[PDB]
Structure of ABC transporter B family member 1:
Amino acid sequence: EIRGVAFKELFRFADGLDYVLMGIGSVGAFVHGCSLPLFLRFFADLVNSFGSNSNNVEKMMEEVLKYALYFLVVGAAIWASSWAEISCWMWSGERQTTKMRIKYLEAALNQDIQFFDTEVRTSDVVFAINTDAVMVQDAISEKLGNFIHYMATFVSGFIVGFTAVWQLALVTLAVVPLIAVIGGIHTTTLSKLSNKSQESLSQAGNIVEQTVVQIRVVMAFVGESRASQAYSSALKIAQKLGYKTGLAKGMGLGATYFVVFCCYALLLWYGGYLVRHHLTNGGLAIATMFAVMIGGLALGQSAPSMAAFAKAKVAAAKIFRIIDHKPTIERNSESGVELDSVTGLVELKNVDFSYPSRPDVKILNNFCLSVPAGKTIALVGSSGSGKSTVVSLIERFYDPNSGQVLLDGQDLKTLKLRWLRQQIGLVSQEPALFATSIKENILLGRPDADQVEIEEAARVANAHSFIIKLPDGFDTQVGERGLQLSGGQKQRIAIARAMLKNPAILLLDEATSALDSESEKLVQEALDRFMIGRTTLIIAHRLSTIRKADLVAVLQQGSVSEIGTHDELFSKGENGKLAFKDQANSFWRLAKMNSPEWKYALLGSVGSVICGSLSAFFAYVLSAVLSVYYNPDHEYMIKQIDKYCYLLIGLSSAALVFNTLQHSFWDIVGENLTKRVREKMLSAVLKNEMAWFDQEENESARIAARLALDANNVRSAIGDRISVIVQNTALMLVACTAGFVLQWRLALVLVAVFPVVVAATVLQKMFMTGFSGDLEAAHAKGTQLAGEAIANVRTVAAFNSEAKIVRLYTANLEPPLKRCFWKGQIAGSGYGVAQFCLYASYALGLWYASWLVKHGISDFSKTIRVFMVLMVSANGAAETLTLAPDFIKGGQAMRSVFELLDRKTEIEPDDPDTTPVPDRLRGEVELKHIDFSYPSRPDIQIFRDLSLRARAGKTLALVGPSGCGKSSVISLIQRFYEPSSGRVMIDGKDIRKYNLKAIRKHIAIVPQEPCLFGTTIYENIAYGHECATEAEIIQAATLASAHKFISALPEGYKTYVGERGVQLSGGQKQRIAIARALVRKAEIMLLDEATSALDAESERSVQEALDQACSGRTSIVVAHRLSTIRNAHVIAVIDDGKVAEQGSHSHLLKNHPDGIYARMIQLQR
Ligand SMILES: CC(C)[C@H](C)[C@@H](O)[C@H](O)[C@@H](C)[C@H]1CC[C@H]2[C@@H]3COC(=O)[C@H]4C[C@H](O)[C@H](O)C[C@]4(C)[C@H]3CC[C@]12C
Ligand SMILES: Nc1ncnc2c1ncn2[C@@H]1O[C@H](COP(=O)(O)OP(=O)(O)NP(=O)(O)O)[C@@H](O)[C@H]1O
Ligand SMILES: Nc1ncnc2c1ncn2[C@@H]1O[C@H](COP(=O)(O)OP(=O)(O)NP(=O)(O)O)[C@@H](O)[C@H]1O
Ligand SMILES: [Mg+2]
Ligand SMILES: [Mg+2]
């Protein structure tokens, strides 16, 4: 394991302004931490004066007034200190992390490629530049400030408590570890159970994704019920674990409240004892209690900052490892010859290169090549041969280990590297389009070029096409969408950027076969205008290229068999605001679906009120005890203290029990609602039709994200909302009742100021959490730009565009920096204002209590009880942070779930209408005058008045070009889609009237590219029939001939398959799909081009399956190749979305002889 760097090195990028910001933030954090208990000290002084000076009214008034002014001063100090701390720390962290990322990227680009090969790899580099960067940022921005603040709080609290009453300081210090340990155990248990629940829900989402991706087969069968069962089982596990999480949370809250109650019972009794012996005052006792508790909790809260410190030390050690690494291969040597002879006469001879990762494996064996000037040369590289390797050696990506490698007769390492890479132009198979605009991509090709050069490169170098037809034109961010560009267009953009680097030799790479001819002809015309551009990769396709290049040589085992011009080089491997009333109605709908759990809810509700009451009750007790401390009769003091302590001890157990009950029952109700919603959501999705599935915004991963997110935030927005609204209502109700019946005037004033103090305490809790936004989202654009640059480092080195990439990264990062600065300023100012208002309200209320006492309106006891009870109950109510307030997004997610459930499918998966279902289908599907138009693309309409025939005891074959919708034909066979105007007779009647599920169970199909379902081959094969037993799957395997390699598998039918399982061959998976089709034993066997996407033994297997299919009922088989359609007796025609003839191939030749398919047959020969 690598060793983390020392703490100081974290601040390597800190400049003078950063040091100033860090100092100011440290001072602010220290002042904040010290001010938290200093207020308690001032409160103790005020209370002691206001209680002792009852007889002397005027002195009491002046004392209370001066201490209220002290409260205002403390409020202002907290305002300023919190503002400075938050703003300075956040902005300094951002300012340092930005420079760190810039240096990291700059160091990364100008490294060697073999460095990425041997040492840290590109994926690790990206993972670092995201996670380690954000980790160090959060550690040095907020964690450090919080650590300083909490250490200050701890020290100041200890000092205040001890110097006030060392005795209670010692006792409370003994108390604190209990509460700290309880809180730590609670947090740890919650985190562990949260991780467990997260992984369980991830599993359930995995079932969701695998179902939605594979919806084709799922609807082809009746397996939606199976998917629902699997989802229900996963959700059952998740909900049982969820029950456990709720119980743990309830026990944690109950235990901490129990220990708090007992501990304050003991502390209050001891404080009464101390006051009785004239050791101290009541106010000093209370202040010591609170201050010592605050200090201990502050140390507890400070520890996580140390954890983050260690993690950031490791992360920054990694980052500095990449940063400090020195480029091994010397680059940009000043010995650059700067040859004026751009023509490369001779190069790449006696080349003995070996790949760095495996130096023993010598890829290139004494390679020699000429590449004469004035003429283009092509290379026939084998797949195992290093065509990319020799290209890299040309580009100087790697240095040849020995060998007489040279260029134009003047070597490579002699004449610099930047200039040489400028001389050579490269195109790549994968276009290198970064996040920036396409015009900026052209600039990245050659920054010296102006806009007119870009236009002409879009005019003469390439044709004017969609690359210009973007709505923004050339100023369009290709990275943000990507799907907008086809792939040929971005390839032509790369061609253009290469055209900018016109001079001297220009290497060419291979292009995919599935590429437009326009890009290809642009490539060859670039070749014609660039005779000095050579090394075109034929790859047995686009033979015009090999026509252009006279010198052609093949490459194998790091050597060339022949050297010279064109020859017989073929057959040697050649191949191819929003409304709220609807919110109330939908809330009623949710509650209605939550009806069965009502009992639990009711019980939970009951627990809530009791919990709330006890919280407020607790406050009152403190109040009363404080009021008792300033009483002359010490015996009456003893009686009151004993009564209150006994009552507190008695109610501690009630607090424990009712916290557990409330949380357990509320969380159980939520889990049931969540699972119930999930099931209904999945069922509604499955009832929908694929015309909705293929539509964008219905992708499998996106659907699963919808399912998870909406479910969880709905359960929050119901359960947490009800629990909060009931519990805090009861708490403030009983608190205000006590306050009113004691002194309604002071109670009314404090009720008026109540929302302010509640908001301030909520903000204190949020500050404890941290005000930093979602940094990864803020840096997302620069993040993905840097990731693309790092992954595509070869292309960046090819155009030596590291400086431009760094500049674009800086430009991307700048607006997030400014936004972060302003967000920090706003957050600091708002938090400070809230705290100042809180302390001003404290001062106002307490001074008003003094004023009431002056006029004889009330007494010290009643006023102090009212003030203390209402303020502590306000803190208890602002403890609202315990339950997550996701309601804001909860409403949107809830309208989302209701619109998804309320969405109607036009094709009913099950037809309610009566249908004349036969046991054995008549198997004579009758396509006639079909004019199907694809819904997704109304422009493309495959079918024009198509009429087809079926053969009951026989089979029909179909053949055509890849363009024709044969898979569309089989889709319309099973009512997968809906024809625009065509009509089809499956059973002497419309398919639309007859039940769809009966159609599914009566028709078996194979997909063109079948993929398997689950762990065991047994279940995947048995999927075809609802009762496959064991024998039926036996002959299903044998007739399909899958059984031989199934037995070759370790455990056969139980062998785990999938991404993590034994990944069978395409032929094997297609054959077992055939086996499943046989399992279904259906009337119509739809054997699509899977009968061609296979191998020779699978080809005889398919011929045998055709034998059985013609023997048993009927089949529609499509296969563009020959020798398979000949098996079927009757063969149809599907050319250009039209039928031309139908019958046997002998019949297809007796009338309408030859044909496009016959020409294909001659070709396949
Ligand atoms: C004198 C008060 C009215 C004062 C003005 C008030 O603002 C002050 O912040 C009060 C409400 C705080 C000061 C110390 C706090 C306590 C800190 O010490 C404790 O024992 C902790 C333990 C545990 O965290 C409890 O959940 C809260 C609990 C029990 C806190 C309850 C609220 C306080 C009692
Ligand atoms: N990242 C790599 N790690 C190890 N060996 C590599 C790497 N890249 C290429 N090679 C080796 O380089 C040789 C040729 O590269 P390879 O990727 O097999 O084919 P290619 O030159 O890209 N041609 P093709 O397969 O038709 O696309 C083989 O010996 C590879 O093992
Ligand atoms: N959702 C869709 N919306 C619009 N057009 C579609 C859709 N799905 C497929 N197509 C069209 O269907 C045609 C493809 O025909 P298809 O029968 O799927 O053969 P293929 O998959 O291209 N070749 P092959 O694998 O040999 O069967 C193209 O015109 C596609 O654009
Ligand atoms: Mg290659
Ligand atoms: Mg098709």
Notes: The first helix runs from residue 16 to 52. The CA atoms of residues 18 and 92 lie 6 Å apart.
